[PDB]
């Protein structure tokens, strides 16, 4: 990620939080300190430029500055003191000094602005004390074009000042002259200006109920009128909007036209409860209201609570975007329009940085990037021109936080990581983990173990580690200012002026040829092994090879083709051929969502963007070959790793193969919360300077290195395994290419089965199975091979199911649904959902989505409970599965709980059982059969009549001695009645269209099987004529003709044979009739 470097220009004076100002375009910053009363003017990095006191003439009255304002385009400050004297601080311009024209780099500009600030001047406006009448200047303000000034005092005096720029014979001076002397009703607090789209017109707010504007007509007139006290007024010049948040926190947005009159557009009551308010007693003052312009059209305010309240003036919508934690008291707020970033300061000592997504829901557009715990209460927050953020801490304390990326390096032996402004943790693979503190802040890190050079802007100090004693001591410094420096075993290579100087540890010069302005000043350099890359300030690329004696430039200087797109970082591979390039966008050093790869052999520049992945990168790294290991493979040299984070942020590490054809993505790798970042790459491991899982991220000493394995480098039993590792890297490359036919041969040399598993995963992702069968069967996963063979044999037409089976056999389970999700295979994913133990997911999935297999889910859960020996849930789910006809009696009979079943058929939780059990018709039928075969005929009859099973009842009644013939006849005729009813209903329903359509459909009612026994009774009583009618009524055509034989009848025989509609029944009765 990234962090702030904190520079505190030391002074024991009491800073006023209300009097820190920043030039809006020039990178400067002015502060007012009390005891002693003075003004420190510093640059944008907190480095002191000058200190200002009262101009001479004071008889010991060192007056107290009360207001400071900047010129909107010049390096000019004006200071209103406590006595009304209006001083003006002016630095001479660089072009006025008539020095050389090479002053175009940032460091030279910083040095010349430092010396010019030391050569600045202070002037006094004539009669300014009288115009304010010895009153302290409580406010001042320049116009938008910055030639009109307005000064307001505590005596309500408001004075307009005309700016006169007097070009002197050798310099330029400035004067401020009074124009008007008007009076307000109260001491005016905030003065705003309005542009016409020059025009002189200033709004004034004294913190009361009404705001008073003044224009060239010398008239002080109100614009908006409110009945409650106002505190802060937000003005938007582009839309001229005037937003006022009342002391009671009520929204009042006024559109303001040319008439300088505010018209309210949105004003809705906000209910902020007054139940035990948190009155600020620690400070002894009213809580400061805070609102600023978050985005064009959107205004944010924090109410001092744990919440942040955003308001969209375009749609009138007010919502809340919360901080990542509760318990954060917001004190001051600021926003950088250049990056679309809000800075949230908390009393607890936190700065939260919110980034525009374009820099779903509208509130998701903002998101917090970094949380920086300063550990001190912040008073005021002021941004600068470049984005550096100044804070007022503890009243008398001031800090300047400048946002940088964390410097880190990995030579091959030890990794160096920056953790603070000046704390650096150096950690080897031998456990040599130690922390070092520098005099100044860390700006550049380079390592060639045990030599390690840190650059602090003004100079580089290279430290030597004696690991035998583990002692580190400064030796000598190289006073240079370039960001380009890199240490090596041969020596240190840096930039002095235009020269790129190569020296030894004792600074013995090695290569020295003077460069020109056309070649320019190198800004970026990278050293690894015996190769170096230099990128100048003009996009020029110089590859080079470092040797024992010289710096052989591998070819000439080259340009590259991409507001403007600059270059901030470059890393060359171990072949010294491909260079990875980090680009930025715009002069604001905005990060870029794409990364670049330059191949010198084909001299191409390919690229890959991360905005497609909604990601922003931070660093890129090649595979560093191990020290004293020159047998590393060629492809192993070309793998590139990039650290990315999405827009506690997510972390990802993405791998690429820098082929000639472009960048081919290999794999992503999310990082955990303790895994802070990536410091190095050394195959097969990402080397991360993380913290312990249970450790303290706040601790600076808990930065331990972790060698996270590459995802396609699993099962590495041997760290000296060379051929297997090289062939695995070749296989990974071929998998990224994809055409797995020779990726099959990439792993034959490997006998590590983890490579076979990775190849099988690739076979799943591709869709090739004949390779995958061998991939399974060479690991002897006979379960998965058996499953694949069965899937091929039973589902030969479908290949997606075989792919899903293979994926399941490879211990990846989320893919089965994704394979044939909507094209429907709900049964198989139901089985998979059960097989993961997620019954409570499978049943709720199938209830809404797959209605055909609720019963198998219930039956499987019942078997699961029965194998758990919980007969309660097992019995209730065998009931829920509609299988209680055979399985609930099974459980009761095999648990020997038959007494309870008899009790149920003829305790709070027993209510649930007895609610359902006694009336289950299948249970009644089963108990009837049970008692019937238990030689209890009468209980069987009772339970059959309770279960209305007509057939069994008729069988029993015709079987009893004596046969209860009349009740059997009654029930048989009742069922014949119902069958006749159904046949007549369907026939009369069909006869409507049969009125016109003559159909000889000789349909018959459904025969009643229960009649059979009745005919049997007459068959046992000689009433065969009666039996024949019931046999035909039963559909017993064979028994019908069996009866019909003894009548010496043949017509009934023939027609019953016809009605049988089965070939045998006429096939034999033919020659039965012939005899």
């Amino acid at each position: 990620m990234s962090l702030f470097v904190v520079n505190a220009p030391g002074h024991e004076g009491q800073l006023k939080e209300q009097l820190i100002v920043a030039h809006k375009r020039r990178p400067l910053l002015a502060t007012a300190w009390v005891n002693p009363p003075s003004v420190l003017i510093t640059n944008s990095e907190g480095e002191v430029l000058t200190q200002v006191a009262d101009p001479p003439g004071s008889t010991g009255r060192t007056h107290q500055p009360t207001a400071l304002t900047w010129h909107p385009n010049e390096e000019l400050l004006v200071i209103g003191w406590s006595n009304g004297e209006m001083s003006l601080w002016s630095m001479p311009s660089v072009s006025s000094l008539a020095l050389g024209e090479d002053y175009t780099t940032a460091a030279a500009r910083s040095a010349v602005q430092l010396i010019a600030a030391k050569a600045a001047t202070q002037s006094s406006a004539e009669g300014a004390t009288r115009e304010h009448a010895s009153g302290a200047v409580v406010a001042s303000e320049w116009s938008t074009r910055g030639l009109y000034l307005v000064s307001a005092s505590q005596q309500r005096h408001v004075v307009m000042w005309m700016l006169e720029k007097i070009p002197a014979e050798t310099s330029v001076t400035f004067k401020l002259k009074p124009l008007w002397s008007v009076q307000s009703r109260e001491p005016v607090a905030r003065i705003i200006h309005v542009p016409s789209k020059d025009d002189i017109s200033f709004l004034l707010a004294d913190g009361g109920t009404s705001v008073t504007a003044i224009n060239e007509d010398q008239q002080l007139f109100p614009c908006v009128t409110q009945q409650e006290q106002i505190a802060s007024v937000l003005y938007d010049a582009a839309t001229r909007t005037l937003v006022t948040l009342t002391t009671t926190s009520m929204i009042e947005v006024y559109a303001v036209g040319e008439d300088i009159k505010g018209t309210s557009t949105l004003r809705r009551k906000l209910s902020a409860p007054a139940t035990t308010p948190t009155v600020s007693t620690t400070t002894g003052e009213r809580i400061a209201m805070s609102m600023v312009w978050a985005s064009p059209g959107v205004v944010a305010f924090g109410s001092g609570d744990d919440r942040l309240r955003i308001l969209d003036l375009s749609s009138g919508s007010l919502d809340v975007l919360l901080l990542p934690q509760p318990d954060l008291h917001v004190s001051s707020l600021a926003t950088f329009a250049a990056k679309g970033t809000m800075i949230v300061g908390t009393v607890e000592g936190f700065l939260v940085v919110f980034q525009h997504h374009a820099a779903a829901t509208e509130a998701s557009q903002w998101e917090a990037m970094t949380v920086h715990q300063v550990g001190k209460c912040v008073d005021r927050v002021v941004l600068t021109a470049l984005g550096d953020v100044a804070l007022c801490c503890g009243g008398s304390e001031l800090q300047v936080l400048h946002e940088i990326i964390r410097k880190r390096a990995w030579d091959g032996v030890a990794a160096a990581t920056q953790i603070s402004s000046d704390m650096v943790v150096i950690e080897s693979i031998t456990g040599c983990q130690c922390l070092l503190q520098n005099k100044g802040n860390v700006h550049g890190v380079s390592i060639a173990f045990p030599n390690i050079a840190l650059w602090n802007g003004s100079q580089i100090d290279f430290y030597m580690i004696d690991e035998a004693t583990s002692e580190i001591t400064f030796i000598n410094f190289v006073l240079t200012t370039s960001p380009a420096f890199a240490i090596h075993r041969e020596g240190l290579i840096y930039v002095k002026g235009n020269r790129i100087v190569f020296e030894t540890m004792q600074l013995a010069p090695i290569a020295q040829m003077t460069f020109t302005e056309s070649e320019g000043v190198p800004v970026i350099m990278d050293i690894m092994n015996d190769y170096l890359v230099v990128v100048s300030s003009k996009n020029y690329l110089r590859l080079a090879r470092i040797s024992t004696r010289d710096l052989q430039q591998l070819g000439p200087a080259r340009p590259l083709t991409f507001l403007e797109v600059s270059v901030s970082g470059a890393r060359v591979n171990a072949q010294g051929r491909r260079v990875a390039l980090m680009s930025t966008l715009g002069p604001l050093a905005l990060p870029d969502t794409r990364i670049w790869v330059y191949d010198s052999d084909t001299d191409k520049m390919s690229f890959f963007d991360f905005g497609s992945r909604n990601e922003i990168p931070n660093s890129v790294y090649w595979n560093t070959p191990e020290p004293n290991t020159t047998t590393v493979g060629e492809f192993e040299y070309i793998l590139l790793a990039c650290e990315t984070y999405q827009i506690q942020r997510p972390h990802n590490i993405v791998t690429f193969f820098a082929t000639h054809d472009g960048l081919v993505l290999q794999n992503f790798a999310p990082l955990r919360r303790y895994q802070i970042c990536l410091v190095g790459l050394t195959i097969p491991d990402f080397l991360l300077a993380s913290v312990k899982i249970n450790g303290d991220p706040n601790n600076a000493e808990d930065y331990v290195i972790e060698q996270k394995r590459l995802r396609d480098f699993e099962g590495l039993k041997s760290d000296k395994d060379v051929a297997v590792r090289e062939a695995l890297m070749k296989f990974s490359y071929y998998a990224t290419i994809g055409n797995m036919d020779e990726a099959y041969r990439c792993v034959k040399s490997i006998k590590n089965p983890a490579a076979w598993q990775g190849l099988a995963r690739l076979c799943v992702t591709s869709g090739r199975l004949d390779v995958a069968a061998v991939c399974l069967a060479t690991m002897e996963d006979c379960v998965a091979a058996r499953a694949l063979r069965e899937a091929k044999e039973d589902y030969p037409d479908d290949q997606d199911v075989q792919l899903a089976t293979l994926a399941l056999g490879l211990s990846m389970t989320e893919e089965a649904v994704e394979l044939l999700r909507k094209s429907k295979r709900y049964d198989l994913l139901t089985d998979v959902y059960m097989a993961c133990g997620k019954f409570e997911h499978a049943q709720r999935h199938s209830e809404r989505f797959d209605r055909a297999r609720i019963r198998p889910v219930a039956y499987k859960y019942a078997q699961f409970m029965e194998s758990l020996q919980n007969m309660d849930a097992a019995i209730m789910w065998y009931y829920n599965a509609k299988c209680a006809s055979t399985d609930v009696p099974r459980i009761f009979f095999q648990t020997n709980r038959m007494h309870e079943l008899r009790q149920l058929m003829m305790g709070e939780q027993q209510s649930t059982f007895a609610t359902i059990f006694p009336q289950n018709r299948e249970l009644l039928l089963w108990w009837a059969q049970h008692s019937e075969r238990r030689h209890n005929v009468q209980e069987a009859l009772r339970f059959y009549n309770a279960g209305e099973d007509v057939y069994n009842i008729v069988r029993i009644l015709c079987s009893l001695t004596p046969p209860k013939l009349d009740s059997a006849l009654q029930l048989v005729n009742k069922e014949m009645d119902k069958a006749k009813m159904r046949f007549q209903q369907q026939q009369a329903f069909a006869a409507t269209a049969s009125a016109r359509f003559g159909d000889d459909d000789h349909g018959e009612p459904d025969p009643v099987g229960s009649a059979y026994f009745v005919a049997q009774l007459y068959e046992r009583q000689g009433d065969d004529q009666l039996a024949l009618q019931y046999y035909q009524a039963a559909g017993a055509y064979r028994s019908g003709v069996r009866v019909a034989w003894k009548m010496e009848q043949y017509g009934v025989v023939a027609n019953l044979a016809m009605k049988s509609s089965d070939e045998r029944l006429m096939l034999e009765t033919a020659m039965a009739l012939e005899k």
């Binding site: 049964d827 055909a852 198998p856 039956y859 499987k860 299988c883 055979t886 409507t992 269209a993």
Partner: protein
Amino acid sequence: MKMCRSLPTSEVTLITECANFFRKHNAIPFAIEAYEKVQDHQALIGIYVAKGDWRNAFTILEKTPTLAREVYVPWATWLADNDKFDEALEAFRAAKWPKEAMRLMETLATNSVTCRKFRDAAFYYIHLAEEYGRFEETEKPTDVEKAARIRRSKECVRRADIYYAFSGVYAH
């Protein structure tokens, strides 16, 4: 409606078009009246299927026996989504469409096997073997596919015999 009943029975197509206009603008009863006046049985069946009434659909089916499929198929899927899967299977058996009949019979035979309803599984498999010879009229299978389904027919007959025999033994 007034202009609809102004029209005679000769201009059938115009009344069908204005009944379509009724149907697009959810004038369901007017569409019913117009389709009735032009005795457009297919549109009556379609609008009743979309509506939900089935008795009227079958009354229309009685006059025209040759319009069976377009009534049974939505009837079959309605029975299927009303969890009456045996009835839906019978309806699919009536109205050809062997793909959905195949799938539903697979699910039902599997449910009978896993829930140990061995008589039900035997019935499902013995009729599933008979269904394995059912193809859509648009597709004429090769002899290879005919053999690949004859083998499954014989296998399912064997499974049906085994399950039907095993039901009584398991019960005992």
